[PDB]
Design a protein around this ligand. Sequence first.
Ligand code: MG
Ligand code: ZN
Lengths: 143, 55, 8, 170, 1113, 93, 165, 168
Amino acid sequence: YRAQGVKLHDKHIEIVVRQMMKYVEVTDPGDSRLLEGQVLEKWDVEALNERLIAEGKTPVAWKPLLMGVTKSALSTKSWLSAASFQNTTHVLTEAAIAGKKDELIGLKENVILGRLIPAGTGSDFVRFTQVVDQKTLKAIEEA
Amino acid sequence: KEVRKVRIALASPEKIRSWSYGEVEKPETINYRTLKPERDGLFDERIFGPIKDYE
Amino acid sequence: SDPVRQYL
Amino acid sequence: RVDYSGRSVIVVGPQLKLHQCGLPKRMALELFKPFLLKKMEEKGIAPNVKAARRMLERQRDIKDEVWDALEEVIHGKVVLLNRAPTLHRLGIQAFQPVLVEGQSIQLHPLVCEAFNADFDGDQMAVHVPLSSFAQAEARIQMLSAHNLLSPASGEPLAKPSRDIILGLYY
Amino acid sequence: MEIKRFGRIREVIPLPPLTEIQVESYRRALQADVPPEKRENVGIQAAFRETFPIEEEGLVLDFLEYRLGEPPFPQDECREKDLTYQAPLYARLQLIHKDTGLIKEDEVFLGHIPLMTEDGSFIINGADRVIVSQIHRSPGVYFTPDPARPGRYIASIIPLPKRGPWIDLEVEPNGVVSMKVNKRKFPLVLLLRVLGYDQETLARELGAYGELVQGLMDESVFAMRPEEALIRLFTLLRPGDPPKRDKAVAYVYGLIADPRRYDLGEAGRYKAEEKLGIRLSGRTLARFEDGEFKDEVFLPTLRYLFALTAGVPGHEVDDIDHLGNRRIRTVGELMTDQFRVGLARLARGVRERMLMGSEDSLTPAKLVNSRPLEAAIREFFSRSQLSQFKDETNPLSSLRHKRRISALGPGGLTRERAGFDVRDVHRTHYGRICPVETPEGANIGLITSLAAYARVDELGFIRTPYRRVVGGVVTDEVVYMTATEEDRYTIAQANTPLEGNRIAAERVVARRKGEPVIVSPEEVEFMDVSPKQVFSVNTNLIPFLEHDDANRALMGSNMQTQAVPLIRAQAPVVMTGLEERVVRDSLAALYAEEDGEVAKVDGNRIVVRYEDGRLVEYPLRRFYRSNQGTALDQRPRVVVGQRVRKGDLLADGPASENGFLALGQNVLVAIMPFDGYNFEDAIVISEELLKRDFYTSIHIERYEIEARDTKLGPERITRDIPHLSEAALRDLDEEGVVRIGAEVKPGDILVGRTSFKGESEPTPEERLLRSIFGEKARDVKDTSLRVPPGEGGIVVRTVRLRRGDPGVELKPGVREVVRVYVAQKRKLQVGDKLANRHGNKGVVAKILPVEDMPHLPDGTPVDVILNPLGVPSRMNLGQILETHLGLAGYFLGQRYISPIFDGAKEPEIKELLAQAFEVYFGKRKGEGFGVDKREVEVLRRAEKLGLVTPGKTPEEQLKELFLQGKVVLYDGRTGEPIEGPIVVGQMFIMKLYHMVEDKMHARSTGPYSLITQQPLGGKAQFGGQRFGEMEVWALEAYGAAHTLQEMLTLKSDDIEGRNAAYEAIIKGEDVPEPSVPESFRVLVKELQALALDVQTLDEKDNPVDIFEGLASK
Amino acid sequence: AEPGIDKLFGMVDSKYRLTVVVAKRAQQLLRHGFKNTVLEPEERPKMQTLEGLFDDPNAVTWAMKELLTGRLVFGENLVPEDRLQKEMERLYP
Amino acid sequence: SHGARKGGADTALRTADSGYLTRKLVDVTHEIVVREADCGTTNYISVPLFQPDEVTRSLRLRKRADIEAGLYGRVLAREVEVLGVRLEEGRYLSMDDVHLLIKAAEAGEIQEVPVRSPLTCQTRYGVCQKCYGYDLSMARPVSIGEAVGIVAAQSIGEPGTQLTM
Amino acid sequence: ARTIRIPVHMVETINKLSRTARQLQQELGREPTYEEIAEAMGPGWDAKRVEETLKIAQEPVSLETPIGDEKDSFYGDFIPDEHLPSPVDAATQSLLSEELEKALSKLSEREAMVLKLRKGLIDGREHTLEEVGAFFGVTRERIRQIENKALRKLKYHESRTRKLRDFL
DNA sequence: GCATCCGTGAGTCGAGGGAAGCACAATTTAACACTTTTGTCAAG
DNA sequence: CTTGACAAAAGTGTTAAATTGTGCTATACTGGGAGCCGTCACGGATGC
Ligand SMILES: [Mg+2]
Ligand SMILES: [Zn+2]
């Protein structure tokens, strides 16, 4: 981009690279039911590892993994977004067998169902804000 | 209530039969002359419901 | 792979 | 595909403000029809909504008071101008419609670069947010005069352009 | 308005007939005028002699001759009645009984062959159509290098498309050459054994190269007899099938030796002989004679491959994109192939019919079923990609379309599977394919235009003309020659100086195999006819092409096709010389057959009394609607008693002025920024153009309605429409159709129709309503035809076709059809697209009053203002030079012809500007006026910018500006001059077919889709705007969650939401919270149909019913 | 730009909270027919009509103008939703 | 005309590649949203100010446009003391701060700047406000609830048509 | 072989009609009209019956047939759904009910119920005079007098206000 | 290691495009009349 | 207001034509046919 004169902040590229490095590969199952060589999200194994330490068990040993944007997108936890992207037959056949439950976390899943996307005015941070004047509030405070 | 999760799973023959309102036994779609759906066909009104509301 | 050939 | 949506050729409006667009009267009448029928019913133009809709059916049956009511209908409201391909988020922007005579959308010169829009035959789509939430989002977040910097780089995106630079440089 | 011609190149030959590619090929295919005995084995005649005779193996059906009858209806009748302009085809066949020895002969009707009109188009189902010529790889034998392994080559034998499998000859790494057929690889030894080849023959022929021959000398099958080798090969080709000789020889003979199934083609046979140096008896890989196979081309192909691998000097690889290896399938060849395909199906039915059913009492009429033949021909002219709706916006549009060459179509490349190699400009495109004219975008390079002087030969190879040069003098002998033949000579350039017939330049610019070289005159063997042969007809219409970048010259030539005819269209001030020929060769205009005197002139017909004594009446096509809606009319240009010579103009066609191609107006153009209304290609025009009806065009729209038979009852086209006042039915006549000459606006009824209402009990509210008002509900409803929004005009024609009318084949159940023609005279308005020939295009953004436009010191305002910023980035300097020349012509009252690459130059333009200044300024001196104070101030600034020489008088400095094309321009608003001189001149601008009137569209509610319940799409359907994925991403990036949700549910497919939203708005309320879209409901049901249990759950994993209990048992 | 948009953005921690407050206030004004406005008669937005100046019918314009005054209290968990509606019904029938 | 056709063919076949790339980038990052003010992570990235030039075998200062694209609108993870100016931890780097850092680097006072980036963010299903930095459209700290993943994908994918030239 | 099944006897007729048309087509050197086909079929056949038979023999066209060289347009994209009420049609029905309810408000507390029962505004189905009488406990003539009285005052109220003529 | 199989390739628009016959039984449907509800006119 | 008269429309019942479904035909007949390369290129995933 620089060689072409395009100016782009490094944040946008680092957001995508963060998604590429989102997964890890298990090398030692430890005191868990995970399989050696199984690929899962880095957040899950770290959360599982800190959990295993809590009850005094051998933590899961993992290895950082890098995959492309297509592979990272297709191996997402939500089957609705993955099915709408590509390999619809392959995504749906695995999700149906695994009985995968889509929690509707991202934007594509909510768009498919026509729901309010969890971003912007639809985010839980601002969605529940209330507005009231100093007279409709003062009267309520009395009660 | 409100939809929070969507789940996909294999459908058993018992579930497929529970979904169905009737077995489609004939390939006939509609009558060629009267243009009404044929009984037990792919467009059967006893299976999939009335063509027009409350009739 | 050919159903007609397989039948024949 | 969406309701309350139109499309027409774009021409340059140099007299417009950064937050304004030139919406043809005929497009606005169809885009804001349910709002216009309510306004026509409120005034003496039509007895009810159904009689109001019959009036707009025939071009020669439309009186001159309908256009005055249409001006009242769109007051404060904004519309969304969209040019394909919408490569970035500035491909859709909110403008306050200004009723004009003609059939071409008048585009402000400063938003051309964000839209990647010139006037050699380009077209854009017009969309009408309906609710107070949809209007508030467009008037606060999507307004053209509020998005002056590029989200990609942080540099100004609505900035002086070909003829504007030439005049100031001279 | 005298015409001044520039240039030095003397063209020895004129332009060939511009439609000969379409017209000559179809004549050679039908052969309808040559007597049957003198017909040659080409076209549909060759198709008859290929499939016939038909033998049962003892009934023989032989073919004797064919003939084409007169068309049942004329061309005008076919267009009016939605018919096909076609000629009946009759075949004279004889049935031969081998047993008895008796012959029965009769003429059988084989169907109708569509006829090509004089202009080179077809009338299919009443619509003019053009068959686009297809370019593809020429059949033959080609030797391409293997990319994976260096030093090795692959021999490919390509037959005609769908006329045999491709054959690959490759030297395997093991050393054994393997022949790949039908995706199957097998050693070439086996098939070579089948062709009666022994070890001695192979070593004697192929043994002079090295170890390659020893790799083809496997004796495990050499001792094996040829008959067993055929059985062994047959099992390899189709494993599993029962291997029998009668089933093996038939397959092998059909594969490479059957002319009816394998056809190398005349082009393929010629290319094979030219390459391999052999003489093919036929067009098959092998000949099957005397009960044994004989080799034709495998050994010559194998010898060449081995020698090429060895490294002999005389053998080389073949460039597949070389235009000597690419041929053109014209309309005649494309139809003949479809004729042969259908005729093969006819033979198939004939074979299966002569073996069953009264074999003793059989006749050729009973055996022959013409339905397969008509179906194949009808399919080609209707549903083929190469059969395209005729583009007849103007005469140039139709001419361009017939000369287009497309690499796509059945048997060609794919729009998305085509790489850069097929899309590039090969060096052999010079003089044969235009390098600039092509549709930018996904179709770039895949659709091209034939060059002006290029012509397609019999074999399908494009040829270009060259002037033979002997001993350094250029002769008048012109040789038409293909790319492969062109590569053997040193061909000079047409701009080479000539001292008469001898080349004067000591160093001559020439081409050797496409590479530019410098050679002496004695080394020159051929010369170009003219620069015009390198470019197509459209590009040859762009003056000063040498100053235009190819990227913009592409746009200029393409946009000339999209220019609409104008009621006051004028030929350009600066021309190239092809304007007369384009009109003449398009057949749009009317010319005298020979010398004669005009007898009667009228707006409807011209009667000419030719010297032969015959009175020939010429009807004039008046206000005829083109396929694109543009009105095509011929206006007489002669008077009663005028003497006309042969070829003299009688009536101007559409978009022509006195026989010259008139695609636009010549307007005074000032090149300057103007208050931001010129911003980013936008155009500023004067109101004076509208006052004198410039850029005013007539367009006709056709509306169609049908009265059909319904189970409830027949639809009636009548004036008695229920629940309508007289105001709505004022313009309808007694028959229910709008009267001719009535002005119709949107919502106005064109044809009144009433249809029976479906039997259904009314809603209880309606029943109370009817009972209150005492009105009996009628049995019919309003289904009349009304003017769509944004349309209208004057009704000019009403066509009423009824069932049983002569030649009217209405669809079953259709009582009648009524067609209404509404014509509107469109003036230039804001948003209409304008363009010039040099690629500069833009929409009108502002129409100013005459007093607001900048004006000359003499008071002449300019007509168009163009932004100078569109020049530097686009590098199209031709518009600048046309403006300078047009400025001289404006004051001298003359037009110019500057041929491309040989025409007007700056010294010649400046000397004309010097003459123009003397009449532009010397007039002012005579009138008694000096130099303006405002002019002096501009001249003071001009000398500061270096535009004029300091120290000269104001008159002398004004001349210097004029010689640069710049004048002192005053401002109509302020009265003060523009601070710098402005390039002002006369330029030819076209009004393109894309108008804002036909593109503006809006919608609140309307039709919705069947399954998804989403709004339809398209202005014609009153559809909504597609809010695709990228638009959804933009709302997500903005954070407009509620705006996005509305466009997903409330405005698209939330049936309960969209009904409530509309009801809330008309009641003055806020729209409600939306619900689940219907598209997701469809997704759930479609997923269930795949046996996938999709369930929507809540916070506690309990299922949530989104179907409202309508699907739960 | 919208009047006082810079001041509006500086009054909330997230620009999307500003839109929620404006849209929710606009609906409150529409529901009660602009009778719950905190704007004095000199401050009510006005539109120029052929007959004369009238109250601006755009509630979003009212909500933005009211919020600049500072007489509106906005936030999360201010009052119960049912309690807020019933109280506003009683004051502004 | 040979080059003009190749350029025209390149443009036609690059729009499909650029458009496909943008769709891939959207679908991998569509769920990334600024979901909290701070995730509490102490990790960071040290954005370099000097580039390892190899032709001269020496460290040379990076281009100003390059340093701005990596430091503008970013929260400092650690305190920086350059040219007598104390940039405290948690301070968003404005253009003046970025220019000040480059000025300090030219004086040999700092080699890299430790800033919070989405790479080291610990927020699940998105980023935090302090790891993203500024809303480049508003030149102020990003508001919680913005779909930065969609913005990032569009920002990268929009100039794709211009890349190959 | 047909998506819309046709009986054997009618299929045999279609085949015979096609053979007759084909034989006449080669004899006349053109496509025969329905008159020539009907005559060649024999007794009991006229142009109307031949035309109806051809109309019956029309196979349904696929909703997924592409149009244009680009593979992005289909037949189903151009066929509107005319079954579900449009938003305009749904809105005017609710507007009509609101206006009708206001008109019935001016009626007496007894007349309105009789009129709505007779017009099926409550149960969805009309009730005959005796059933309306069995509902209230009066003979049929009482309802026919009440209905004619309730329906007449509505004419007066509508004529004196003209708030209900537009919906008609 | 390499062969081999599978899925992927911008957006909006636009317009044009739209070869068996018979017998026989079995079922369905138009055609008809008679009686029964419903609706209506009178009366007191 | 209800009684009764009074009749038009609507509702059962028979029933003939019209339509639809099903069986049968006896020299002998015993393994298909359209496709057919500018094979699209390239990355990934599986496999043996
Ligand atoms: Mg453009
Ligand atoms: Zn963080």
